[PDB]
Amino acid sequence: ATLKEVEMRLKSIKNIEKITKTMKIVASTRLSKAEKAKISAKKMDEAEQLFYKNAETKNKELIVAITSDKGLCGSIHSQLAKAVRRHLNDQPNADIVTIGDKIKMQLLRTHPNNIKLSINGIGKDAPTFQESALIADKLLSVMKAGTYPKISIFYNDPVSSLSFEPSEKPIFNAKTIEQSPSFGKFEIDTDANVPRDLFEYTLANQMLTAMAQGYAAEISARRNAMDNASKNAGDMINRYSILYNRTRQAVITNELVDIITGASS
Amino acid sequence: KVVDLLAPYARGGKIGLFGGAGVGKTVFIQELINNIAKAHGGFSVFTGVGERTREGNDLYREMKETGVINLEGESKVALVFGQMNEPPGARARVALTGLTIAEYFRDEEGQDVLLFIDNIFRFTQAGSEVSALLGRIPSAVGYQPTLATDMGLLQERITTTKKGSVTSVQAVYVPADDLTDPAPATTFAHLDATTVLSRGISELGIYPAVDPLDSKSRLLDAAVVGQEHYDVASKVQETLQTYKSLQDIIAILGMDELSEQDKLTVERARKIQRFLSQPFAVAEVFTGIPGKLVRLKDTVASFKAVLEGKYDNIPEHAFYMVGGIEDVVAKAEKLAA
Amino acid sequence: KVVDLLAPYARGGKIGLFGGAGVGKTVFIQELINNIAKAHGGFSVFTGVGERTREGNDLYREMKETGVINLEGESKVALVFGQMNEPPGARARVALTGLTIAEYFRDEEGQDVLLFIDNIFRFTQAGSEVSALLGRIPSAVGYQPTLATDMGLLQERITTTKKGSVTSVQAVYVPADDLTDPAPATTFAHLDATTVLSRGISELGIYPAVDPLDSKSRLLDAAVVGQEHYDVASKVQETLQTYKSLQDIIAILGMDELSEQDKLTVERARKIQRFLSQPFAVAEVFTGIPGKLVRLKDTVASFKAVLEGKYDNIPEHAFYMVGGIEDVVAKAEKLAA
Amino acid sequence: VQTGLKAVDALVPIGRGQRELIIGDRQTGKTAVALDTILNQKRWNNGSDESKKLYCVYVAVGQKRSTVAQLVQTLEQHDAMKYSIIVAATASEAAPLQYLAPFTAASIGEWFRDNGKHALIVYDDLSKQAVAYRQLSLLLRRPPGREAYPGDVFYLHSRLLERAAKLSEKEGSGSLTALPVIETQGGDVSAYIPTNVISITDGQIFLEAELFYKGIRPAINVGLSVSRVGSAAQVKALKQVAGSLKLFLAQYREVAAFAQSDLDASTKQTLVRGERLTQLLKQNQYSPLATEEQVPLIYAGVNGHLDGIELSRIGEFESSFLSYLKSNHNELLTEIREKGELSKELLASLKSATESFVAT
Amino acid sequence: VQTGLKAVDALVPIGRGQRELIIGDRQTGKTAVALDTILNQKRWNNGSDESKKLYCVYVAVGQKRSTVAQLVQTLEQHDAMKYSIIVAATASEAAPLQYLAPFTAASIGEWFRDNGKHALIVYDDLSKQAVAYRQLSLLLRRPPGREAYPGDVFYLHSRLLERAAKLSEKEGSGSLTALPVIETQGGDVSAYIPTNVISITDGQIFLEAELFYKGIRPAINVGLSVSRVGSAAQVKALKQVAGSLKLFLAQYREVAAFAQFGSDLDASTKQTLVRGERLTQLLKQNQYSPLATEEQVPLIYAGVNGHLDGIELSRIGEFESSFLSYLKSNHNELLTEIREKGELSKELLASLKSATESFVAT
Amino acid sequence: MSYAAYLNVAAQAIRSTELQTASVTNRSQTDAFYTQYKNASEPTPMTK
Amino acid sequence: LQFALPHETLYSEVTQVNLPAKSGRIGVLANHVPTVEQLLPGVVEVMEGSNSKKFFISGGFATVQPDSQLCVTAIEAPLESFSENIKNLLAEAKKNVSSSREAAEAAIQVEVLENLQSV
Ligand SMILES: Nc1ncnc2c1ncn2[C@@H]1O[C@H](COP(=O)(O)OP(=O)(O)NP(=O)(O)O)[C@@H](O)[C@H]1O
Ligand SMILES: Nc1ncnc2c1ncn2[C@@H]1O[C@H](COP(=O)(O)OP(=O)(O)NP(=O)(O)O)[C@@H](O)[C@H]1O
Ligand SMILES: Nc1ncnc2c1ncn2[C@@H]1O[C@H](COP(=O)(O)OP(=O)(O)NP(=O)(O)O)[C@@H](O)[C@H]1O
Ligand SMILES: Nc1ncnc2c1ncn2[C@@H]1O[C@H](COP(=O)(O)OP(=O)(O)NP(=O)(O)O)[C@@H](O)[C@H]1O
Ligand SMILES: [Mg+2]
Ligand SMILES: [Mg+2]
Ligand SMILES: [Mg+2]
Ligand SMILES: [Mg+2]
Incomplete structure (x- = not known):
């Protein structure tokens, strides 16, 4: 509790509070940018999935986990990895592909030989279909996607700004699509692989929507978290400020005494 | 628990309680008198230096009631009192009177003597009170220049010798809550087990408000307590020390930014921490819960189980202010209803 | 490399080496003697003021083996010793003893001298140790009232004049690593060039421990070294200053969250940090690496090159503990093999 | 008092009779600021008009004689000696002399003050004068206080600096301006001496090695530097194109940490001025600028004619602008130098000449 | 001057003639380091080669008597008392005796140095000697220095500590080696006395409480500990396999500080983290167990060349003794060469290389 | 590219100096990487 | 309402839609048969009585609904006022x-x- 220390101690917190307050305001603008891509993706989810509402399609499991590589955003990855283990109880031997490292790191520790593929370099900018297609493609590629009895994507749904929600959604494959109760209503010409395509493109599209929602749920979290960091380092600064003045003060008195005593003699 | 497990006291050794004002050195000592002094048989010498006369009047009531002091019977203890109302000469001395009495019981009548001093700080504070008027140039923090050797003369007398054992507990006061003040700094090197009270820890409502990380004893050695008690100790400390290292990240970022292994340690350390708290019978008029005494073998097992995570699934609160591991499973069932 | 690039020493100048304990002052000063004191046509005095008798021992045995001394022929250096094994009065005057011998060659041999003092802080300290016994009230930080003028009264004799030139290298102990300690804080005003050794630097394995920003020399001015030299030297400084400024954002948000120019500035700053270290000959006992000496033009050219990116591909380790850019290429390949 | 330093003249304007304090840690640039003020007086001291000249008094306290020697050799190299006085109380001289020198030199200044003329006086430095006073007192065994200074160490410096003034018409209207130098230690403005002195002066020019290693020289912390006199002492023309300057650089200090990917065009812009503006206030040593040479650059800056230009070219910009303005617009420059104010016409003149150079 | 302390004999190797500070807070293990050093000399003192022997002088300054007792007992429990001399100025004795002890002691062991032999002086501890030297002066009324100490409290220690030296051949080659101890408060090394001695000695060993409680014992702080003699006083074999360890261990703290960002690691950082963690763990050591060089060497070699890197962290404990057990049993011919020769020849590196791999596959 | 992506090459040949103000120029640059994972240990890295 | 790109969603009431289907062009109308078809890389058009507005497209899916709503989905996309x-x-x-x-x-x-x- 020397003065030298307390000073620099108090500095590096001010310097932290700065960064955290920059973080918060930067997220505010970034959430505005990813707000419009969560309306333009959750609308294309409308036109797409409505066909599925009319021909009610009801579904070696493939779970795809979605987050990012970024920390500093509260329990985004922590509590998504938990709902993924909650569902990974009922099928201990279900394959996972993870998008974003923080989730991979989480599950890698608990179902370490479930995962077969992993993607990275994600939650930096807003996700685009270009990615959403390449991951869908590689899921078809190495992962043998269509040849799976069942596929479900796991993502963080954004309920408000302050709170998000771990969520799940079903992908259905070629066979499920043909076999759906009201498929008969739709005069889709059996003119060559037609349900296949619908699947291959509902895998990219569904995936996108999830990613858009996941990212915009994460940005909210990052914002809120960084926000509290600023409040705390704010309160810490206050404490150390008080401690600083004490030490200063005594440094003056103890220093002075040394002289007074030297002087009386 | 904290002592038994972490910094074991030694028979015929020198024990000291460090702490600032109102952390509980006095109540802690009364718990030690409670346990040891009853089933001890031999002679005790209690010395009130610079404390409250209330406290001394209370201790004289307390003994006549347990029967340690029997006005009409025999008696196991002796009372010497130079209390905080006394002039600095009185208080600069009264402890030497206590000591002389104990030294007789040790050397002449070859006895096991229990010797409680409270508070030994008040002897060195008195030394400074007079020192300038004695014409002396002061020393750092305005203490008598003789503070070390005047303590060495007194402390070096409170001792076991080839003619008789003495166990002594001394209450150490800590000016301004500063441990590096030259009075307590110099004390430490005179003790065999040192157990410190943190103000902060008491403000957590943890009692005894010991510092699990600052308390020491020469007796925590495998050659004495044995590999397991030795290891249950270290591992407990690593856990607590880690919690301590993270106090900053958790203060700003909170828990969500910790990794997985880190996260566990904290929840575990916070349990170990609460479990180190123990209801004291003497302090009953402050908890409300009738006090508990755990045993050494009892404590070690209990903690070992927690460190093997055999209780992770129990709300942190269960570990707070109860006896041994049995009491944890009890309170947790009570609350889970 | 770092001196001649950033804070170049002035012939006739005065040159202090600031450094807390064991950051490499004495080694540095010996590396200087190893180089300067051969190529020097004239005479040299070395003053040992309150250092380690054994350091002195080494020097006397090095001088013989470097040839600088020759006990059966011609010698180029005088040795004046007053180490810490000696009482304040002695430690307080032996600087002037040495300094006088220098003076005599300056003024009466009308020629070039090199005056080596290690360590000049002990002149001030020794002054300190008797001050009170001479009955003076202590000044601040318990230094004597005469600190300023006493240092003045010595330092001002160590000086190039019309009759001849002295060039002095004085190691300056910086107590408690505190530069604002009245003693060193005073010495700054006395020197033409200041080489500041830093614990932070040395802890990185970066020897010599020179702080590239806090080091200064009056001669770093275009008028003295040319524009290009001055521009390189300024840019190297801007680089490292930026890299220093960004170490907040690197800790907190990684290296990830950076502008591309920045990412490169950091890449270049790190490469540069290393190219400022260098194996001393003297310090072979420490690196087992052969002493490398670099020519001033070679310094500037290589830093120039580094700065314009004509080396962005080479790995960080290739710049560490090597001589000129030759050695960067040599190592780059030797390691990639 | 026109110092020639863009940053100082524009943002921390000094008046005659004022007491502006130069303050910073060692090796930040304190002497350089003073010395450029001194070097900049040739503009008038070589002229005829008395009321417009300014005589220099440099009080050297406890400096290495070789330093002083070189400070001499530097003013003679700029023909500034002819109107300067050096009172020298070097490192090695008896403490009384170091204690006395500033009062000694004070009385030298007042000669000019009392005689209807104007001097300016640089105290380099007061830190070391206080150290000297201390030596005397302790030895005389006068009783010590904070840091072992005598009670009247304040009274020491108050006496000194209160002597500086702008005298009234009845007194010949002469003046004495004060540039005390104060040396902080690790930046400590609470340090005993800096406290006293800061509370005597009319403001501070504040230096920082941080800004210095960044390459911003003069290394003036703008946010920390104030001149309590301020507005009242500024070439009306420079004050005309710079009421905006403290404004812009204030907001640039507040959005600074945003220099690290997704910023909105408003706070993007703020970072665009700031860098250029800061660049514009760098100034090599010994080259102080004439007012009529400052106001164009500060004009093109503030009114956004540099936002287009890249940040490295702001160097060669100034050189080429001014030499062009000299050849092709020497008349506007002349009006500024003579009128000291800017016509509604002169503002369109400069504007046009700028837009022409910026286009070219 | 082989201490048999892994951390010390690889990181801050101490030499016959050098002065080496042991500094840290109270209850950190300062005395323990000094003690474990003394105990070790058994290796050579029960021999007959007078010039390999190291006689110990332990100066007790301001210690309580029983604590000096508790200590001579342990020396005897280890048959270590036959080559030591304790000099005691306990807590209760006169300030003058306390102040004097180190000087008187320095002379007792100066006898050894002057007479062709090597002593080892442990000053436990100077902080108290200065407390007492302060006491003479304040009472003699000499006016005080900083923190009421006398003006030349530095001179006090400087003249003692300079008395340690390694004499020349002409003078009998005798050495005297000093391990002063110094107690800080609150980790502050910038307080008066520590500062004084820190700059007087040829390096320090910093012990730290934080390190201790998280399981590094000796709680040496590599970051801050130095021996300024350096490798000059290391055994050649130890030197050879300790190439760069101390710098590496620094880089390790580096990457472990960046780990706190908890942002994903690459194969380079995870790599050095795995090794640094195991190296850290490999230097932990129980009190009272100094190790022979040839026990140390193969351990260090196994760690450095990364044969330990695929082994559980809790199990490195058992690795150590299980390894040594096997090396004694089988490749004893190496262990005895390392010892006799002190230098790993190229083939000996081979045998050792083979020998380690062999065992790591259980 | 694919079918999944068919209309992301038909939209990225049909991407390639107008609308590309941020929006589309960035819709075209994706910075993803995949890596296959085997018995804990990986396989190798490659751009998406 | 129902005609979406992932970045930009477009249309809402319609009198005639022309699409470039899997097998040749087709035209949905006021009441049409519920159908799904892959959308080939080609031009499209909307109607609001007599309103001509043609877009290009990348390809995707069309889906005429039983409830009569037509949903058209593509990736990238005005006519010559674009390419x-x-x-x-x-x-x-x-x-x-x-x-x-x-x-x-x-x-x-x-x-x-x-x-x-x-x-
Ligand atoms: N073990 C405990 N259990 C419950 N309360 C405690 C305990 N120890 C201390 N306290 C509380 O803290 C207060 C002070 O305890 P006390 O034993 O008087 O401490 P002390 O440090 O000896 N104070 P003082 O003697 O005036 O410097 C009491 O009133 C108790 O309520
Ligand atoms: N504007 C500038 N441009 C370039 N160099 C400068 C400038 N100002 C100062 N310097 C240089 O920076 C160094 C510090 O300037 P200086 O005037 O010595 O500050 P100072 O406070 O007087 N240092 P000191 O008083 O000796 O502790 C000098 O060596 C100058 O050459
Ligand atoms: N390697 C070790 N392993 C376990 N315990 C150790 C080790 N080294 C020291 N200790 C213990 O830590 C306790 C205090 O150690 P010690 O060697 O006295 O340090 P210290 O700085 O001399 N303390 P002190 O001088 O009394 O303030 C002793 O009980 C030792 O048993
Ligand atoms: N160039 C270098 N290379 C490697 N190690 C160095 C170098 N310079 C210094 N050191 C290390 O630092 C230690 C101290 O060097 P030294 O020059 O004695 O420091 P110092 O600051 O002069 N000590 P002091 O005179 O008390 O202030 C040595 O033992 C070396 O290990
Ligand atoms: Mg009490
Ligand atoms: Mg040295
Ligand atoms: Mg200056
Ligand atoms: Mg000890």
Whole structure:
């Protein structure tokens, strides 16, 4: 509790509070940018999935986990990895592909030989279909996607700004699509692989929507978290400020005494 | 628990309680008198230096009631009192009177003597009170220049010798809550087990408000307590020390930014921490819960189980202010209803 | 490399080496003697003021083996010793003893001298140790009232004049690593060039421990070294200053969250940090690496090159503990093999 | 008092009779600021008009004689000696002399003050004068206080600096301006001496090695530097194109940490001025600028004619602008130098000449 | 001057003639380091080669008597008392005796140095000697220095500590080696006395409480500990396999500080983290167990060349003794060469290389 | 590219100096990487 | 309401939609048969009585609903007020790449490109 220390101690917190307050305001603008891509993706989810509402399609499991590589955003990855283990109880031997490292790191520790593929370099900018297609493609590629009895994507749904929600959604494959109760209503010409395509493109599209929602749920979290960091380092600064003045003060008195005593003699 | 497990006291050794004002050195000592002094048989010498006369009047009531002091019977203890109302000469001395009495019981009548001093700080504070008027140039923090050797003369007398054992507990006061003040700094090197009270820890409502990380004893050695008690100790400390290292990240970022292994340690350390708290019978008029005494073998097992995570699934609160591991499973069932 | 690039020493100048304990002052000063004191046509005095008798021992045995001394022929250096094994009065005057011998060659041999003092802080300290016994009230930080003028009264004799030139290298102990300690804080005003050794630097394995920003020399001015030299030297400084400024954002948000120019500035700053270290000959006992000496033009050219990116591909380790850019290429390949 | 330093003249304007304090840690640039003020007086001291000249008094306290020697050799190299006085109380001289020198030199200044003329006086430095006073007192065994200074160490410096003034018409209207130098230690403005002195002066020019290693020289912390006199002492023309300057650089200090990917065009812009503006206030040593040479650059800056230009070219910009303005617009420059104010016409003149150079 | 302390004999190797500070807070293990050093000399003192022997002088300054007792007992429990001399100025004795002890002691062991032999002086501890030297002066009324100490409290220690030296051949080659101890408060090394001695000695060993409680014992702080003699006083074999360890261990703290960002690691950082963690763990050591060089060497070699890197962290404990057990049993011919020769020849590196791999596959 | 992506090459040949103000120029640059994972240990890295 | 790109969603009431289906162009109308078809890389158009507005597209899916709502989904997309030399210089590099898995992607470009030329 020397003065030298307390000073620099108090500095590096001010310097932290700065960064955290920059973080918060930067997220505010970034959430505005990813707000419009969560309306333009959750609308294309409308036109797409409505066909599925009319021909009610009801579904070696493939779970795809979605987050990012970024920390500093509260329990985004922590509590998504938990709902993924909650569902990974009922099928201990279900394959996972993870998008974003923080989730991979989480599950890698608990179902370490479930995962077969992993993607990275994600939650930096807003996700685009270009990615959403390449991951869908590689899921078809190495992962043998269509040849799976069942596929479900796991993502963080954004309920408000302050709170998000771990969520799940079903992908259905070629066979499920043909076999759906009201498929008969739709005069889709059996003119060559037609349900296949619908699947291959509902895998990219569904995936996108999830990613858009996941990212915009994460940005909210990052914002809120960084926000509290600023409040705390704010309160810490206050404490150390008080401690600083004490030490200063005594440094003056103890220093002075040394002289007074030297002087009386 | 904290002592038994972490910094074991030694028979015929020198024990000291460090702490600032109102952390509980006095109540802690009364718990030690409670346990040891009853089933001890031999002679005790209690010395009130610079404390409250209330406290001394209370201790004289307390003994006549347990029967340690029997006005009409025999008696196991002796009372010497130079209390905080006394002039600095009185208080600069009264402890030497206590000591002389104990030294007789040790050397002449070859006895096991229990010797409680409270508070030994008040002897060195008195030394400074007079020192300038004695014409002396002061020393750092305005203490008598003789503070070390005047303590060495007194402390070096409170001792076991080839003619008789003495166990002594001394209450150490800590000016301004500063441990590096030259009075307590110099004390430490005179003790065999040192157990410190943190103000902060008491403000957590943890009692005894010991510092699990600052308390020491020469007796925590495998050659004495044995590999397991030795290891249950270290591992407990690593856990607590880690919690301590993270106090900053958790203060700003909170828990969500910790990794997985880190996260566990904290929840575990916070349990170990609460479990180190123990209801004291003497302090009953402050908890409300009738006090508990755990045993050494009892404590070690209990903690070992927690460190093997055999209780992770129990709300942190269960570990707070109860006896041994049995009491944890009890309170947790009570609350889970 | 770092001196001649950033804070170049002035012939006739005065040159202090600031450094807390064991950051490499004495080694540095010996590396200087190893180089300067051969190529020097004239005479040299070395003053040992309150250092380690054994350091002195080494020097006397090095001088013989470097040839600088020759006990059966011609010698180029005088040795004046007053180490810490000696009482304040002695430690307080032996600087002037040495300094006088220098003076005599300056003024009466009308020629070039090199005056080596290690360590000049002990002149001030020794002054300190008797001050009170001479009955003076202590000044601040318990230094004597005469600190300023006493240092003045010595330092001002160590000086190039019309009759001849002295060039002095004085190691300056910086107590408690505190530069604002009245003693060193005073010495700054006395020197033409200041080489500041830093614990932070040395802890990185970066020897010599020179702080590239806090080091200064009056001669770093275009008028003295040319524009290009001055521009390189300024840019190297801007680089490292930026890299220093960004170490907040690197800790907190990684290296990830950076502008591309920045990412490169950091890449270049790190490469540069290393190219400022260098194996001393003297310090072979420490690196087992052969002493490398670099020519001033070679310094500037290589830093120039580094700065314009004509080396962005080479790995960080290739710049560490090597001589000129030759050695960067040599190592780059030797390691990639 | 026109110092020639863009940053100082524009943002921390000094008046005659004022007491502006130069303050910073060692090796930040304190002497350089003073010395450029001194070097900049040739503009008038070589002229005829008395009321417009300014005589220099440099009080050297406890400096290495070789330093002083070189400070001499530097003013003679700029023909500034002819109107300067050096009172020298070097490192090695008896403490009384170091204690006395500033009062000694004070009385030298007042000669000019009392005689209807104007001097300016640089105290380099007061830190070391206080150290000297201390030596005397302790030895005389006068009783010590904070840091072992005598009670009247304040009274020491108050006496000194209160002597500086702008005298009234009845007194010949002469003046004495004060540039005390104060040396902080690790930046400590609470340090005993800096406290006293800061509370005597009319403001501070504040230096920082941080800004210095960044390459911003003069290394003036703008946010920390104030001149309590301020507005009242500024070439009306420079004050005309710079009421905006403290404004812009204030907001640039507040959005600074945003220099690290997704910023909105408003706070993007703020970072665009700031860098250029800061660049514009760098100034090599010994080259102080004439007012009529400052106001164009500060004009093109503030009114956004540099936002287009890249940040490295702001160097060669100034050189080429001014030499062009000299050849092709020497008349506007002349009006500024003579009128000291800017016509509604002169503002369109400069504007046009700028837009022409910026286009070219 | 082989201490048999892994951390010390690889990181801050101490030499016959050098002065080496042991500094840290109270209850950190300062005395323990000094003690474990003394105990070790058994290796050579029960021999007959007078010039390999190291006689110990332990100066007790301001210690309580029983604590000096508790200590001579342990020396005897280890048959270590036959080559030591304790000099005691306990807590209760006169300030003058306390102040004097180190000087008187320095002379007792100066006898050894002057007479062709090597002593080892442990000053436990100077902080108290200065407390007492302060006491003479304040009472003699000499006016005080900083923190009421006398003006030349530095001179006090400087003249003692300079008395340690390694004499020349002409003078009998005798050495005297000093391990002063110094107690800080609150980790502050910038307080008066520590500062004084820190700059007087040829390096320090910093012990730290934080390190201790998280399981590094000796709680040496590599970051801050130095021996300024350096490798000059290391055994050649130890030197050879300790190439760069101390710098590496620094880089390790580096990457472990960046780990706190908890942002994903690459194969380079995870790599050095795995090794640094195991190296850290490999230097932990129980009190009272100094190790022979040839026990140390193969351990260090196994760690450095990364044969330990695929082994559980809790199990490195058992690795150590299980390894040594096997090396004694089988490749004893190496262990005895390392010892006799002190230098790993190229083939000996081979045998050792083979020998380690062999065992790591259980 | 694919079918999944068919209309992301038909939209990225049909991407390639107008609308590309941020929006589309960035819709075209994706910075993803995949890596296959085997018995804990990986396989190798490659751009998406 | 129902005609979406992932970045930009477009339309809402309709009197006639023309689409470039899997097998040749088709036209949905006021009441039409519920159908799904892959949407080939070609032009499209909306109607609001007598209102002509044609877009290009990348391809995707159309889905006429039983409830009668038509849903059209594509990736990228005004007519000639959107996409000559921009096309030309690209067509060059396109054909070049074909002669090269990598050149297979260029095959996709030739057909998509050749189509756009007609507009
Ligand atoms: N073990 C405990 N259990 C419950 N309360 C405690 C305990 N120890 C201390 N306290 C509380 O803290 C207060 C002070 O305890 P006390 O034993 O008087 O401490 P002390 O440190 O000896 N104070 P003082 O003697 O005036 O410097 C009491 O009133 C108790 O309520
Ligand atoms: N504007 C500038 N441009 C370039 N160099 C400068 C400038 N100002 C100062 N310097 C240089 O920076 C160094 C510090 O300037 P200086 O005037 O010595 O500050 P100072 O406070 O007087 N240092 P000191 O008083 O000796 O502790 C000098 O060596 C100058 O050459
Ligand atoms: N390697 C070790 N392993 C376990 N315990 C150790 C080790 N080294 C020291 N200790 C213990 O830590 C306790 C205090 O150690 P010690 O060697 O006295 O340090 P210290 O700085 O001399 N303390 P002190 O001088 O009394 O303030 C002793 O009980 C030792 O048993
Ligand atoms: N160039 C270098 N290379 C490697 N190690 C160095 C170098 N310079 C210094 N050191 C290390 O630092 C230690 C101290 O060097 P030294 O020059 O004695 O420091 P110092 O600051 O002069 N000590 P002091 O005179 O008390 O202030 C040595 O033992 C070396 O290990
Ligand atoms: Mg009490
Ligand atoms: Mg040295
Ligand atoms: Mg200056
Ligand atoms: Mg000890």
